[PDB]
Design a protein around this ligand. Structure first.
Ligand SMILES: [Zn+2]
Ligand SMILES: [Zn+2]
Length: 61
């Protein structure tokens, strides 16, 4: 809506696509299921933390 496109990144940091944006519940990692290192076969139905929150690193990437 007005003054509110979405939260975090309005597009994919990787592919620049802002459709099925898979963003971390914490970090502004608005990605996709194939716009990360570990590819997901489907979109997580709920809350999903970025592919960096899965480990104590990848934050300075
Ligand atoms: Zn993408
Ligand atoms: Zn995260």
């Amino acid at each position: 809506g007005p003054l509110g496109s979405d939260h975090h990144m309005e597009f994919c940091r990787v592919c620049k696509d802002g459709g099925e944006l898979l963003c971390c519940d914490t970090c502004p990692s608005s990605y996709h299921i194939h716009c990360l290192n570990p590819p997901l076969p489907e979109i997580p139905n709920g809350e999903w933390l970025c592919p960096r929150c899965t480990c104590p690193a990848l934050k300075g990437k």
